[PDB]
Amino acid sequence: MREIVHIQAGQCGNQIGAKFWEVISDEHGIDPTGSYHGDSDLQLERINVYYNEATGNKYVPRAILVDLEPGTMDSVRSGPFGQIFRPDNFVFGQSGAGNNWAKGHYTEGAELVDSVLDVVRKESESCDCLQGFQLTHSLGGGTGSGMGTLLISKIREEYPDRIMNTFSVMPSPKVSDTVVEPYNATLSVHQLVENTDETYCIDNEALYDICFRTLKLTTPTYGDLNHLVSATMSGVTTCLRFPGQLNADLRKLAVNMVPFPRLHFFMPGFAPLTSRGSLTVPELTQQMFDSKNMMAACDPRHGRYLTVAAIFRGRMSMKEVDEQMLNVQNKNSSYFVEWIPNNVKTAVCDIPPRGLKMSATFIGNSTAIQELFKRISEQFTAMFRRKAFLHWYTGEGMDEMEFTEAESNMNDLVSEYQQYQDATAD
Amino acid sequence: MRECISIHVGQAGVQIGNACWELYCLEHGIQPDGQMPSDKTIGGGDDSFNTFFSETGAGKHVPRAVFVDLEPTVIDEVRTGTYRQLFHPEQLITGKEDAANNYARGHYTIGKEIIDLVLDRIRKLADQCTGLQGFLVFHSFGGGTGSGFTSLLMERLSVDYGKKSKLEFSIYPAPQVSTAVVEPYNSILTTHTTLEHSDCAFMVDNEAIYDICRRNLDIERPTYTNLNRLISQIVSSITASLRFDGALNVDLTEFQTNLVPYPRIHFPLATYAPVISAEKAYHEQLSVAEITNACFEPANQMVKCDPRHGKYMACCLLYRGDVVPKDVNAAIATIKTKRSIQFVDWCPTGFKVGINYQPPTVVPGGDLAKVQRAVCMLSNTTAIAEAWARLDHKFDLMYAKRAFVHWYVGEGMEEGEFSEAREDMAALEKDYEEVGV
Amino acid sequence: DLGKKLLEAARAGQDDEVRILMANGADVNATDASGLTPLHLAATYGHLEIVEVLLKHGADVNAIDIMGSTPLHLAALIGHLEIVEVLLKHGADVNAVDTWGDTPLHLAAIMGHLEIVEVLLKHGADVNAQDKFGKTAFDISIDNGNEDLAEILQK
Ligand SMILES: Nc1nc2c(ncn2[C@@H]2O[C@H](COP(=O)(O)OP(=O)(O)OP(=O)(O)O)[C@@H](O)[C@H]2O)c(=O)[nH]1
Ligand SMILES: Nc1nc2c(ncn2[C@@H]2O[C@H](COP(=O)(O)OP(=O)(O)O)[C@@H](O)[C@H]2O)c(=O)[nH]1
Ligand SMILES: COc1ccc(/N=N/c2cc(OC)c(OC)c(OC)c2)cc1O
Ligand SMILES: [Ca+2]
Ligand SMILES: [Mg+2]
């Protein structure tokens, strides 16, 4: 396992995808031009995982940019790191989606999917040992969710033995009070349960609460929310990009974190929580399992952990990490399943991000994530009971039965989390 | 002289095999470039160390070893390490995509793409042997390659080398330095499919070695480096009878005769003493009776179990160094009634003793201090079933919920194999209970 | 049939077409196959001007469809703060109950329309109103972990 092909779809996917490249390029010593300016040798050991190698020691990010809105490409080009992207990887259509999952998945998006797959094969063949794909998108819109899931099913047919990893942004009325978002989100979850190997659930509801209440921001913006997203995506991919003890394998991560195929939705966490303008080991382990440090609006103390992976970063005592983690597992033993022995793995890396000296990234497969799916299901049913704006989807060639099946599939997902949450070993 | 071929599978098998062959060269006096000044017979010979080392026309001594792993990361260090000039380049076999800690990926899918190439390279080494007696297989229980590919390899070697013996050095999983959560699965799956094809297996409990490095060596956070150096010290004491002159366990067939009373119970327990830290270079040299007393202490064992809870069926003592035979006879005489050592009624209550009058060799950079005498006890006790019980319990916890099973079913393996492998482990625990534990 | 043309005119938001049709005797209280009046569709699609014009021409502000949905139910669900105040201004029942047991307060709480929740409470929204599952508006806030909504319901 080696190279990873990055894909960003929609306005949110390209926005959170652009911030992902601006952060790791700073950690690897890469300037917007591409010339390596790092001051340590470890910044180039596993650099080939996310970057190509152009002539002249130039590093080209293995990223594909797609959106039905033609104005998003200028939003990315005008960015700071918007010049390093390969001009051949800009696939933008003419007609947008208008927050319609149907236009992205059946009409407007079905015309643009073949143009993207041509550049996916172009990138997948320039890899020495391709391991999987990485996608950033929101589930509330129409492009990143309707065409994003369609792009996944297309890649799943031609690359079935490769790992599909997504960073899906969940909608929230506290950030976007668009009443058709529970539709597109529910229809996307119906596809993500079947065609993804591991999905990071980034909830705008939790992102808003962290900025508004934890960071004391009366009016959080998309820049403030994405600051928590960029720091999260950097931590969950620290082992994939830097030398350490973990094998940096997408499949090894999926085998050790997915006990049941449908339960592959992770609850990311990060500590410490800081803002854009501005701790010990026992404090990082404490804040890590705190509900205030979760990127999903779910209380982990309301459910039971199935599998947990904690990545520590910075210069810290290797022995103390094994002490505080083992101690936290005892004080919260009622929140770990007893039929999965040794279900908490600990990783530690020596290169922390900039601005901090220590950090901790939490990746938990918890049954408490059902509270997220219950929130979207309750809003979906409320709108679907009255059939509000249902003609916006049937007019694009969608069947009404696809809503009840998505509602039924998502309710079955919730019952599955509750099933293993009440199970015992004896 | 009968040649022995060593096989190293997976990261654990390769890294431990690297430390063992380093120690073999230091004990035999072989330079890292394969030269041996004290080998007056150039181009060949009939010496005892030729069981593990072949000789070329230029006087180079090459190990009879094969390194195989489904990914090249671990073996590439052996290709650029200190002994990069020692091994045949065509005996370092590497794939591209590993088994991802999946027994099914190593046995049914990924392992099939390189199994025929590995056997052809083993065939080349077998043709150079005049009287090949068997193989030594190094692998882990928890890894996808160490469990899946090794089982596929052992099944093939039985068809191509039916009369030859096969011995294992297996790595028992430990939560302190484990890699995967499904390691209880892989360990049970590989034990069931390899039980028929293995004549004798020495299990190394990573937790037992981990505690020894903490207590005896004062190492707070032991790494794989500290574990493998101590493991190689014990592997050398076990294979010393095959590589030097002696009258105990002189060939692989005698290993089964002295340690294995019945085919299925071929898991002897190994104990080593003394283990002294290198920070104590001016330590007191323990007597023969003191190091022999330390063989029946559970804290010095390579597998976490209490031999007082079980009965012995065999017991061999391999001494190394300044050891007078009358001191061993006096020691065993006292350590016969002064302790609660129980032998089964159908076994001759005795102790086989072999003495090598050369003290153990320490490696530069190791954690162990030079000792003038040491002992390695190999005993087949029913108390080692305690380790199978710990492994079978963690297996039942996850399989009762069918957790992580879809990863195995999706790789060409049927779910029914999980049950018959667990039933085989149940029949193995009964084998020890029918003897007494 | 001018009633069916008035339904689509209120849905599409054609203000000029609504006036001309009502001048020719169009049934302002006409219904579709599901019982939706022109006031239902106008409050659903955010056509505030058509809402006020219909209310001045004999539109039933408390009309229900086959599922018991009043214009206040749909306006609170979609989140039209301006239309909700106009409906409440013309005597809309703030505590009307649909077939699912929901009130306008329930739908605004579920969809996160905090401003609408604040307006309904000031107009006499029953905080003790239960749905067919026994949940009230405050039960939705606690079950969903919405502390912002919980503070509004604790005035
Ligand atoms: N004592 C010791 N144990 C090791 C060493 N390396 C790995 N292990 C153990 O082996 C187990 C995992 O098996 P590995 O050998 O690393 O995996 P593999 O054989 O390469 O198979 P893959 O899953 O495909 O990578 C872990 O539980 C480790 O504790 C080592 O160098 N020394
Ligand atoms: N965290 C975050 N969320 C975003 C951002 N941009 C859009 N979103 C969310 O995405 C949803 C809208 O989907 P969008 O991606 O804009 O539509 P699309 O063009 O069809 O993919 C809204 O609910 C927003 O909350 C962003 O920059 N950061
Ligand atoms: C519950 O048991 C376990 C949980 C997690 C384990 N490993 N976790 C990872 C996580 C990674 O990135 C976040 C890796 O980088 C992609 C990664 O590469 C190997 C492993 C291992 C476990 O035995
Ligand atoms: Ca010779
Ligand atoms: Mg490996």
Residue numbers in the entry:
A (entry chain B): 1 to 278, 284 to 431
B (entry chain A): 1 to 437
C (entry chain F): 13 to 167
What did the publication describing this PDB structure actually write?
A prominent example is an azobenzene derivative of combretastatin A4 (azo-CA4), a photopharmacological compound that binds the colchicine site of the αβ-tubulin heterodimer (hereafter called tubulin). Tubulin is the key building block of the microtubule cytoskeleton in all eukaryotic cells and among others essential for cell division. Using time-resolved serial crystallography at a synchrotron and X-ray free-electron laser, we capture the release of the anti-cancer compound azo-combretastatin A4 and the resulting conformational changes in tubulin. Nine structural snapshots from 1 ns to 100 ms complemented by simulations show how cis-to-trans isomerization of the azobenzene bond leads to a switch in ligand affinity, opening of an exit channel, and collapse of the binding pocket upon ligand release.
Further reorganizations (black arrows) in the microseconds open a channel between the βH8 helix and the βT7 loop. Interestingly, some of these movements are reverted in the microsecond time range, where the βT7 loop starts moving.
